[PDB]
Symmetry: D3
Subunit: 144 residues, 6 copies
């Protein structure tokens, strides 16, 4: 990492609070490989190069396949993802671009074809946290 | 009103999110600035639950009907301090992170008004409301 | 202001005031017109109009809760089905430059308004769209 | 038309007609106004107004080359520095809902128009923006 | 032009011409291809191509009313179902960078065209999208 | 695929292949071309092309760090000045439907490439844009 402002040095509290997001999802029932896809697809949408690099590397270390890794930015028209992963990425895409308009009503319905309500909160936790990391990532000018 | 009571489905999720709130309660950054950050991001993201909560909180604190109504269109008004306007510029750009690059001279601009600890706390504020909005919209919360 | 356009062109101003005279004599509820003006001025980024029409709406006894929730009205229970159908029209027509409007849309507001009300709502929308272009164009701050 | 808005509200029709009376009296060139009208109608997707104003410009003869190049006017050499300035304005005010307008813009047109003219141009912009909303919303088709 | 690219790379020019050579041989009707070419060049902001294909279309018959209405074709009564299907395809493939194609679109197209004609329509779309890229990139003017 | 377009139109497919034959004879580095193809397909949403060009880039060189960073290339240190100039051109021309090309942009790539190289680059950009339209349009999946 290179950065324009060492935000964990300047505010240990903020850094500790953000780790708390990670600590809660580390405990989550939701699969780590799904979460990695959510982190990776979100960081791509948000243009956070540090987080893209980080989370591609982690998904790959856990053996994520180069085929799914390269195709994730265009997942909709690929045969590579399960209906469960696809519902979670639809959620991810829409919630990454929340500034752009209303979220479709039936999206949460589609999720619950594939996930229980606890998984959905954990999923939304993951979206929420990466969107948070990306904002420090890009705002503080961090680079891989 | 909600479609999914997520704080009950995942107590860990809720605590962690409260964690962000506990950290900003300890922040040096002023609460009335945090309220405008929260209210404005909530407007941008279309979180009607959060817009309602944070408008209400700013007002009780609080904080002036003219500034609350003008906030959505702050840029072209004379109601906000140079420092508030630096933070609101930051807030607008970071709400719309999916939409493109961040103006590369922008962080330099809020360095004219905040120190680095404050920048970090501001970005924490920006990041937390962005997160709460994702919950408010995702779970279909209404005022 | 950057350019006092009413002094520059008295004719333009009186044509613009004439829009207000036509809808001052409209059978459409004033409080609703106020919400059309405020929402449109929000969408178009006209601080002068936002301040003016929030202030007039409040003066006329609109609620703070409704005034602060207007920008996110879709996901609130504060507005009547009638107000909601007008605000959906307001929103689409504010953004006319950004694509087609759904054809089912006029049929939908037809369920809430008669044809004279629709025509009057559309005048309201056009007028504030008009006022907003002068507001922003000429650099008016509130 | 799906809805006879002039029949439904005679006051709306008369107010709008009054905007056309003000600009009929204005100093600003008619051929410039027809380009403003046609370009806005293109951006707003009002097929009724595009057909009406392209026909009217052709009738006053306006020049098929300029009519066909209007929609891409920026990278053509068919338009004057004064038309280009008015068309930049037209473009920005059509799209007012999409964000703020660049502050240099009003400064730039003051290099080509005096303040009375700017007020008349802006009236033309607002007027056609208004007609387009009636045209599209009421489902007019040529 | 800012860069005479055919001279710089006669090979590039030769492969680009090969697109036009294949479409010359196509079953698909020339007047439809001109509309596709015209509408794409409008959308992509290539004034060079706009000028060229409006001119070609007209000198081949085709009708001032249809040429002025092309840019708002959707809300006009001027175009056949066959042409409407190709223009929707054209609009969407012009704006490929802006999101996904409706899955229904190809099926819709299949009601009016055979698969050979679709392939040829896609070639046409692809070719003008290619020509506009040189046209705008190399700073060519009409 | 939803439509075997090479069988429906052998002539379309031969023409498209002739674009690839021309760029195979180009001086422009193949590694640079695979990045332009890959980045364009990402932007245009062609999963078929993204798979193919990710795979060919990896075969041949080239280095997971770069493949995964490409979609966010601007904010990485992984790409050379020459490559960054070509990727700015690629991004802009991918999104031609969205506005005017920045006016100093050719002159910037001109600091890194001679004119032949910038007919070849623009040929690559144009060809992958064309391939993406067949891929998305015919509903091809990897």
């Amino acid at each position: 990492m290179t950065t324009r402002l060492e935000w964990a040095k300047a505010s240990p509290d903020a850094y500790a609070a953000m780790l708390g997001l990670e600590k809660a999802l580390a405990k989550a029932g939701l699969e780590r490989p799904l979460i990695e896809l959510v982190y990776l697809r979100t960081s791509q949408i948000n243009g956070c190069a540090y987080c893209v690099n980080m989370h591609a590397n982690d998904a790959r270390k856990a053996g994520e396949t180069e085929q799914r890794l390269q195709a994730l930015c265009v997942w909709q028209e690929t045969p590579y993802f399960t209906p469960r992963e696809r519902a979670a990425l639809a959620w991810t895409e829409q919630l990454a671009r929340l500034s752009q308009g209303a979220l479709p009503h039936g999206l949460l319905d589609e999720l619950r074809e594939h996930f229980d309500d606890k998984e959905i909160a954990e999923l939304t936790l993951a979206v929420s946290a990466i969107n948070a990391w990306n904002r420090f990532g890009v705002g503080m000018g961090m680079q891989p």
